[PDB]
């Protein structure tokens, strides 16, 4: 547990994937969502993979 806490930061990694897809994060996944959700509301293709891969790039840069 000494190398698994400092050498590799295990538990920080645990809350990190929880911020991704357990929705434990702030307006990170929120501001990812509403651009996609405004395209759903007018039923225009939101998949469109490419911009979504830039929307999670923009997600993780929110809150800093």
């Amino acid at each position: 547990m000494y190398t698994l806490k400092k050498d590799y930061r295990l538990v920080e990694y645990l809350q990190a994937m929880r911020n991704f897809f357990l929705l434990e994060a702030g307006d990170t996944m929120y501001d990812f969502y509403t651009p996609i959700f405004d395209k759903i509301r007018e039923k225009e293709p939101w998949l469109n993979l490419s911009y979504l891969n830039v929307q999670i790039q923009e997600a993780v840069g929110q809150r800093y």
């Binding site: 929705l23 434990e24 702030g26 307006d27």
Partner: protein, 436 residues
Amino acid sequence: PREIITLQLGQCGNQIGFEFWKQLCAEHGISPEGIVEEFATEGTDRKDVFFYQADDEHYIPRAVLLDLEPRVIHSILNSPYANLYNPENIYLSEHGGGAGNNWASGFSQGEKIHEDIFDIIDREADGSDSLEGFVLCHSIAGGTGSGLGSYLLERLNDRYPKKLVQTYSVFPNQDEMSHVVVQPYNSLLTLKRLTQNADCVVVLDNTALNRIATDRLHIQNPSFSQINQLVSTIMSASTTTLRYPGYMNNDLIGLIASLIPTPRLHFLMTGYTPLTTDQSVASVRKTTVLDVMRRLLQPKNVMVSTGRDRQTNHCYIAILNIIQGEVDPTQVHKSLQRIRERKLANFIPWGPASIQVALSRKSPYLPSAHRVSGLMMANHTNISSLFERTCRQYDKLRKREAFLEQFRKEDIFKDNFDELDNSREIVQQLIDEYHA
């Protein structure tokens, strides 16, 4: 960004917005010209969702302070807060106006500084890339803040109508009438604009305010300079979903939308319990979460005047109860269970009401690290009680023949007197038709 641009307007509306910013500097622990601690990112996880983003390692609020009397903004340069604000991108130093006590001055002053009043909000919005709205922190107290603020409810509802419009109105003390005489006129003039040029508002009152200031603050004589302390904190309390982590309703337009069922019923009463500094000695034995929402559903913290025999012939419809700081988020479902057996919240006699409960983690500060905090954002159908108090002093005033031709000199020359009177009667009736 969920940047909201605050429209501080008025002699009193400036001051209540002024200590709103100083509060944010006291808890983020910052210097007003430098970020001198690591509490800016450890304490708070967004610090520029209401502020202009770092480009010098500093944060510049998203506020504009325009006012007819430059004297309230000149009292900001005698404090170390005129380098937290800027000299033209927040406020123009020495921007004059009227006398000003007339409403019809400030209404015509938005129509000739018309070019600059929509350049100052867009000078201070060069990093909003997805706008929340505009919250008009404009006071009804004084003719300065009610006149120019009534203009801006209209031009921001024709360019940004689906975006938030929401005002913190404070109707001046209605137990004076020889301190202010233009008081039924400036109130009913903004009240026309809240219901068809605006979505939702959050009302307040001064005469229900000072009730609490001697019961929980314990001042010797009510005077405006303690009134601003109690208001400035509930303004930073309502944005603790948007400045710290969350998910369900983590927007300010997420919280406020769910307190509206029908237009003309969206007037939110505000209540805030930890004003007493004898609850910091009763936390060594634990203040519990079970009873902190049994004093939020109690009418004691009510900043809007109303009867205690008008809550037996009316019921609350939507009530939001926000805990900050300690909460214990496993016994909060234990807190709501006992609510129904006492029945301190009334439920509408035509379906179930709504008790929305929320929690939020905060930056280290005294009612969010040692003692429980409750913000209430009520929605009660007894709100016609202020409107009857203002409309019975408005037609009485016309029976003394005041401001029916001592008001028709500057831009009123038609009959618009019955226009405020009747549109107030549509509001007094439509609430009662939709509430048994």
